[PDB]
Amino acid sequence: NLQPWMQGLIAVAVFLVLVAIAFAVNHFWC
Amino acid sequence: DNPADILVIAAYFLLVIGVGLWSMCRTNRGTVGGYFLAGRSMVWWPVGASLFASNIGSGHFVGLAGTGAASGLAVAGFEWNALFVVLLLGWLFAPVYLTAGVITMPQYLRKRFGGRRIRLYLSVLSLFLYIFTKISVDMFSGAVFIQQALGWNIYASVIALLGITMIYTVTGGLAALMYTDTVQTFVILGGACILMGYAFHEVGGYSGLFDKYLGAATSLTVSEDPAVGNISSFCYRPRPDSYHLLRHPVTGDLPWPALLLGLTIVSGWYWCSDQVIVQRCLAGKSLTHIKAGCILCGYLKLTPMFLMVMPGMISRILYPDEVACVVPEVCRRVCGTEVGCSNIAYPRLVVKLMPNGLRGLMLAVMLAALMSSLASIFNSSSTLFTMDIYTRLRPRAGDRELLLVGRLWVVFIVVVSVAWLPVVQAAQGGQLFDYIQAVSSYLAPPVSAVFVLALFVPRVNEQGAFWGLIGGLLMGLARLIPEFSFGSGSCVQPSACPAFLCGVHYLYFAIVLFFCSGLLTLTVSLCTAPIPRKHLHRLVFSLRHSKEEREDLDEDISEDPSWARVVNLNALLMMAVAVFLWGFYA
Ligand SMILES: OC[C@H]1O[C@@H](c2ccc(Cl)c(Cc3ccc(O[C@H]4CCOC4)cc3)c2)[C@H](O)[C@@H](O)[C@@H]1O
Numbered sequence: 299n300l301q302p303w304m305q306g307l308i309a310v311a312v313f314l315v316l317v318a319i320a321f322a323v324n325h326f327w328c
Numbered sequence: 329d330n331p332a333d334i335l336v337i338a339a340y341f342l343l344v345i346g347v348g349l350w351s352m353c354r355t356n357r358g359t360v361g362g363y364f365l366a367g368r369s370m371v372w373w374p375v376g377a378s379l380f381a382s383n384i385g386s387g388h389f390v391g392l393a394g395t396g397a398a399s400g401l402a403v404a405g406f407e408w409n410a411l412f413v414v415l416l417l418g419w420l421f422a423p424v425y426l427t428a429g430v431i432t433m434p435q436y437l438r439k440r441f442g443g444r445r446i447r448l449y450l451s452v453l454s455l456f457l458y459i460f461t462k463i464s465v466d467m468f469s470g471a472v473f474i475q476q477a478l479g480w481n482i483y484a485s486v487i488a489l490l491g492i493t494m495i496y497t498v499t500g501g502l503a504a505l506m507y508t509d510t511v512q513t514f515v516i517l518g519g520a521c522i523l524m525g526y527a528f529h530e531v532g533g534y535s536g537l538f539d540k541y542l543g544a545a546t547s548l549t550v551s552e553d554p555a556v557g558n559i560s561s562f563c564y565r566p567r568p569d570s571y572h573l574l575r576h577p578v579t580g581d582l583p584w585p586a587l588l589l590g591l592t593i594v595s596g597w598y599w600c601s602d603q604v605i606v607q608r609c610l611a612g613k614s615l616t617h618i619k620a621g622c623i624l625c626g627y628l629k630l631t632p633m634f635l636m637v638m639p640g641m642i643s644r645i646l647y648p649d650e651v652a653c654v655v656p657e658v659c660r661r662v663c664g665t666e667v668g669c670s671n672i673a674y675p676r677l678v679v680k681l682m683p684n685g686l687r688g689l690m691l692a693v694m695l696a697a698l699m700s701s702l703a704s705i706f707n708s709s710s711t712l713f714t715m716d717i718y719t720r721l722r723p724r725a726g727d728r729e730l731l732l733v734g735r736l737w738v739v740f741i742v743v744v745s746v747a748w749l750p751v752v753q754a755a756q757g758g759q760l761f762d763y764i765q766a767v768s769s770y771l772a773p774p775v776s777a778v779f780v781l782a783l784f785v786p787r788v789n790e791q792g793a794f795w796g797l798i799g800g801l802l803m804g805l806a807r808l809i810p811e812f813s814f815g816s817g818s819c820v821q822p823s824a825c826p827a828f829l830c831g832v833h834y835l836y837f838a839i840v841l842f843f844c845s846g847l848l849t850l851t852v853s854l855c856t857a858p859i860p861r862k863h864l865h866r867l868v869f870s871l872r873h874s875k876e877e878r879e880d881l882d883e884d885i886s887e888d889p890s891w892a893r894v895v896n897l898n899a900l901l902m903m904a905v906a907v908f909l910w911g912f913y914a
């Protein structure tokens with residue numbers, strides 16, 4: 299059973315990945 | 329009537345007038361920057377409290393609670409989308425609006441495109457959107473709260489409410505309203521938290537709520553009117569998706585693609601583009617303080633779920649036969665409407681769950697929310713009308729005259745809202761809330777697209793924007809006129825609109841209208857004259873930091889990197905928390 303506090307961590311994880319890639323493109327592409 | 333409630337509301341009025349006169353002693357009035365921008369002397373905590381207090385209102389209490397009762401959690405998305413777009417504002421739109429030095433958004437389009445018809449038409453559309461989607465909300469919801477909780481009369485009540493708020497916004501300006509919005513946000517949060525605690529205690533807590541809701545159906549399903557008879561067992565029982573925030577894309581109210589995209593559009597308008605919220609963000613001492621206010625308002629915008637949505641579900645738990653009724657005559661006997669009686673969730677929670685001093689406190693919470701929202705609308709409308717119209721029509725007027733112009737416009741908008749009150753009283757149940765989100769979805773997306781392209785596409789021009797706006801207006805009316813004409817109803821009495829019209833939820837239509845208007849602007853721009861670059865310094869997100877001169881077709885945002893790092897960091901943290909809460913609630 300996939301409890302809701304697991305879904306919370308999954309969403310936080312994908313959000314953190316998105317922000318990390320955004321900062322990477324800022325660092326390189328600006 | 330009540331010994332202690334009188335003193336609690338008296339102390340509330342006392343704090344109100346105290347902060348108001350403290351700001352009067354500190355106001356520094358006499359300049360439009362004072363009255364319409366608080367002299368740009370506002371810091372983080374009042375900016376954030378002002379954004380939250382102005383957006384939060386009686387509409388939020390009644391609508392979120394009633395929808396939670398009838399449907400379930402999902403409506404919380406309306407609030408949580410703000411938490412993202414507000415950041416977009418604070419990091420994309422507010423800097424430009426600051427480095428352009430505008431007092432209004434029509435002014436921004438006036439000096440970014442050039443001409444007198446865009447500014448005029450957008451000001452007029454903004455005024456009508458405020459009359460339809462904002463003032464009607466709060467008047468309707470205060471009306472419901474008074475009709476149930478107190479019920480002595482409804483016209484006199486809301487008229488008196490608008491009178492006090494008229495005086496409030498006339499005297500105040502942005503400084504008074506933002507400081508007293510600090511105190512009002514404090515009041516709203518404190519009272520709502522206490523009532524949430526009481527409701528959780530009476531149901532048994534979060535677990536006690538998540539257990540008993542799907543079995544919270546009414547028992548009386550006969551409908552002695554022979555037309556309806558035995559009811560479907562489908563509309564008097566709670567939805568099996570009541571506990572979920574992401575409903576089905578097609579066979580579900582508030583479909584998740586609709587929620588995300590359509591609210592992003594309508595809310596990009598509601599925060600980044602419309603004068604109320606931006607003008608809250610134009611009175612900022614600096615950019616960093618405005619960003620701090622955005623994060624604060626966002627963190628508070630994660631709150632109205634637990635304080636308005638879940639309490640409505642609790643109402644359905646405790647009073648299913650009274651809030652979850654379906655039978656026309658039963659609901660009419662309970663409220664007066666024959667469409668469901670979902671709106672009575674929050675008022676009956678308050679009336680039957682809390683003691684005398686907290687009865688007074690809840691009346692004060694409702695009063696504070698309604699007053700702050702109406703004060704925001706009236707001051708922002710004053711800004712829009714005064715600046716745009718009075719300058720295009722009398723371009724040489726002393727500020728001792730412009731102050732008078734805005735002050736009197738407040739009186740006029742109040743009279744207009746009083747005039748429109750019965751047209752709002754003619755809606756029943758949740759119909760008004762539906763209607764208003766529908767109006768926004770039809771009329772917002774073009775404006776949303778125009779601002780997106782104005783800030784992020786240098787190419788677009790006067791023809792671009794004007795024709796996108798007119799095309800969006802005609803497309804929106806094409807659906808609004810018939811759909812609003814055929815009527816509205818529930819499972820008991822559903823109006824006979826065609827499926828190809830009603831079957832497409834208004835948020836999907838907002839996406840389509842957004843894209844049609846944006847495409848039309850880009851088209852009619854790319855086949856006409858461009859606008860040179862010399863006109864667009866400090867008017868597009870590309871040219872924020874340009875120090876060179878502008879041609880003026882008619883600043884100095886230097887945040888210290890340390891506090892910049894701090895505010896960036898906690899903004900991202902806020903988003904992380906909001907995304908968590910989206911995941912936790914499906
Ligand atoms: O215009 C979108 C923006 O609206 C601002 C706003 C405006 C009016 C109202 Cl009343 C409310 C609360 C509410 C009450 C009852 C509701 O029920 C709906 C759903 C189906 O039934 C009909 C929905 C919302 C929010 C939201 O604060 C901002 O975040 C959004 O961007």
Ligand SMILES: *C(=O)CCCCCCCCCCCCCCC
Pocket residue numbers: 799803844845847848851852853854855856
């Ligand atoms: C450009 O050459 C100037 C005239 C533009 C005529 C063609 C416009 C095409 C627009 C396509 C998108 C329409 C969206 C819905 C509008 C009601």
